[PDB]
Amino acid sequence: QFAKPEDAVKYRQSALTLMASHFGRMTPVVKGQAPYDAAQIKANVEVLKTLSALPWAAFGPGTEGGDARPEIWSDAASFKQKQQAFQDNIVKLSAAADAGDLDKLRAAFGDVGASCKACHDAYRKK
Amino acid sequence: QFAKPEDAVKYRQSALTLMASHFGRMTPVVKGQAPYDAAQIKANVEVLKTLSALPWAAFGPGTEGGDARPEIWSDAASFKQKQQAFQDNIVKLSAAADAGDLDKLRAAFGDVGASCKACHDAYRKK
Numbered sequence: 001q002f003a004k005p006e007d008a009v010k011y012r013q014s015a016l017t018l019m020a021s022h023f024g025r026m027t028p029v030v031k032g033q034a035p036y037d038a039a040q041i042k043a044n045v046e047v048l049k050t051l052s053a054l055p056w057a058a059f060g061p062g063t064e065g066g067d068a069r070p071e072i073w074s075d076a077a078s079f080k081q082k083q084q085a086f087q088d089n090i091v092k093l094s095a096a097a098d099a100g101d102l103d104k105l106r107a108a109f110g111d112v113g114a115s116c117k118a119c120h121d122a123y124r125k126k
Numbered sequence: 127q128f129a130k131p132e133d134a135v136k137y138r139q140s141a142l143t144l145m146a147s148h149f150g151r152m153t154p155v156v157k158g159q160a161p162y163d164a165a166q167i168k169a170n171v172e173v174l175k176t177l178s179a180l181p182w183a184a185f186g187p188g189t190e191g192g193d194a195r196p197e198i199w200s201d202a203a204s205f206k207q208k209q210q211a212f213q214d215n216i217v218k219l220s221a222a223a224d225a226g227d228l229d230k231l232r233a234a235f236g237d238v239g240a241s242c243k244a245c246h247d248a249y250r251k252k
């Protein structure tokens with residue numbers, strides 16, 4: 001759906017910004033600094049689940065650019081494992097949120113965050 | 127969820143970029159320049175439905191900035207009508223996509239596009 005590589009870069013950066021917000025906005029809740037309302041978190045996590053599927057199709061062949069490392073494309077099976085593992089960690093978070101279980105939510109949130117960082121360490125410049 | 131107004135601006139601009147892509151990528155399909163696969167469009171429109179609910183909470187009080195006109199906030203009931211009417215037009219598109227009806231999809235796509243433009247004309251600078 002992208003006319004130029006820059007359009008795929010803009011798309012993925014936008015998608016990743018919206019993850020970051022739907023992930024990160026739960027930080028005060030998992031820390032107990034903000035109240036836990038199970039319905040509101042269940043709804044937020046379902047938005048995050050949708051968003052978390054979106055960036056990867058905007059790293060298609062030839063869409064080098066942005067802060068993406070060039071190994072995303074030379075190592076496509078490894079990049080695919082990292083995004084699939086991340087999305088699997090999101091499924092854990094969805095199960096916790098759907099269950100209304102704040103201890104499970106806390107644990108799953110930490111696992112998701114570690115999976116963001118695992119990908120960054122391999123595949124994000126800087 | 128936004129520490130500064132700039133963070134709400136970045137969020138809404140990202141959300142609106144991802145709409146634009148999930149809307150606009152269907153243009154060749156509604157024109158017949160690309161093939162119509164009912165399942166693929168049904169799935170795309172459900173992403174667009176999720177995305178189309180997101181921008182509006184990032185125009186909260188005091189988040190002036192970007193290319194947003196200042197009337198978004200002085201006229202909050204009118205802005206709310208425009209986003210709700212837009213989302214209602216998205217429901218029409220979802221019904222068409224869920225039905226696998228390309229003529230209904232065409233018509234609903236045009237109505238959605240007109241609703242994007244109606245809001246821009248009132249509320250987007252330039």
Ligand code: HEC
Pocket residue numbers: 009012013014016017019020023065066067068069079082083086112113115116117119120123124125
């Ligand atoms: C690989 C499988 C990734 C996972 C999982 C996550 N991120 Fe990431 N992120 C990735 C890359 C390759 C890039 C660079 C994209 C580019 O072309 O520039 C990023 C970038 C971000 C950004 C910045 C987006 C921007 O506005 O430019 C943010 C805010 C970001 N990533 C956040 C983030 C979070 C919170 C994640 C887990 C919830 C996450 N990312 C996972 C690669 C991958």
Ligand code: HEC
Pocket residue numbers: 135138139140142143145146149191192193194195205208209212238239241242243245246249250251
């Ligand atoms: C009001 C109820 C709107 C509707 C419906 C749509 N858009 Fe819009 N759009 C709106 C505003 C106020 C702005 C400016 C936001 C800001 O703070 O700068 C926009 C902006 C866009 C953009 C640019 C995003 C960017 O990267 O900066 C795009 C691509 C865009 N809008 C597309 C778009 C489409 C395709 C719509 C219908 C499917 C649509 N918008 C509806 C206000 C509103």
